[PDB]
Each structure stands twice: as C-alpha cells, then as structure tokens.
Amino acid sequence: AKALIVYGSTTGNTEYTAETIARELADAGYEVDSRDAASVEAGGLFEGFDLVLLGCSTWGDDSIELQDDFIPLFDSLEETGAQGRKVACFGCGDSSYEYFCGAVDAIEEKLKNLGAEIVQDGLRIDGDPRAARDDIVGWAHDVRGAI
C-alpha cells in the first residue's frame, strides 16, 4: 500500500502525531511518505497514493484558523487529485475552545465535496498527543483495516 502523510504543525504536536501514525503504518508493511505541509505542493500531490492522511492543528480561538503551514494546501485541495482517493484526517486541539479541532472538520468536508473517500472519521486529539498515544496507535490501526 502506498501512503502519503501531510502535516501542518505549529508547536509540533500534530507532527509527533504524524510520526506515530507513520511508524504504525511502516510496522504494518506500508510504504510511508511523510511530508511537512511547509514544503508541499498541491498539483497532483496525492497521485500514486493508495492512502492520504491529512493532519493539522486548530488555532483561532474565536474563529477557526488552520495551522499556518497548512492553509495554502487547504486553499488548493481541488488540485491534489482527491476524487476517489481513500483519505483520513487528524489533528491536535483543545476542547476548551469553542471550535475543538475545527481544522479536522474543515479538511474532511472539503475532501468529501471533492469526491474523496473518508475511510475513517478524523482523529481529534485534545491535549498532548504523547498522552493519547494509544488513541493514535488504534486510529492508525483502524484506517488500515478500512482500506
């Protein structure tokens, strides 16, 4: 299986998360391409991937704002080759804000209108993902099983 993992992380929580999902994947026999959104490009980004996992933190406080590095890609999802593509989304937040992990919400929806297949619902980590370590391992686990 060929997986793509793209992430936008500010204080590196979602990045740690991405790393955990990657190693879970890799340990299962998947080929894993892990990329910081800082550096990526949308034009056919997803082409040649059997699985695309999108990760992003939630900022904003009183409105939803996507992790900084992430926005540009988000603006361009219609150009990644998403349709028919099998995808899952993940991100860090804090349940204390009005819009808990609203960036996961946003991304999936856009994916969905694009014609992508959400094979599993989004992992919405509240707090330090080093403290949800298991959750992480388990969601990685169910995404494989739903492909």
In the complex, least distance from residue 110 CB atom to ligand FMN, rounded to whole angstroms: 18
CB 142 within 8 A of CB 120: yes
- CA quadruple 123, 136, 130, 20: dihedral sign: negative
Site residues, ligand FMN (CB under 6 A): 9-15, 57-61, 67, 92-94, 97, 99-102
Pairing of strands 2-8, 31-36: parallel
C-beta of 85 vs 123, nearer to ligand FMN: 123
Residue 92 has, within 13 A of its CA and on its CB side, a CA count of 21
CB 138 within 8 A of CB 115: no
In the complex, least distance from residue 78 CB atom to ligand FMN, rounded to whole angstroms: 24
Question: In the bound complex, which residue of the shown chain has the CB atom lying closest to ligand FMN?
Answer: 93
CA separation for the pair 147, 136 (Å, rounded): 17
CA separation for the pair 56, 125 (Å, rounded): 10
In the complex, least distance from residue 54 CB atom to ligand FMN, rounded to whole angstroms: 13
C-beta of 12 vs 72, nearer to ligand FMN: 12
C-beta of 36 vs 79, nearer to ligand FMN: 36
In the complex, least distance from residue 106 CB atom to ligand FMN, rounded to whole angstroms: 11
C-beta of 28 vs 64, nearer to ligand FMN: 64
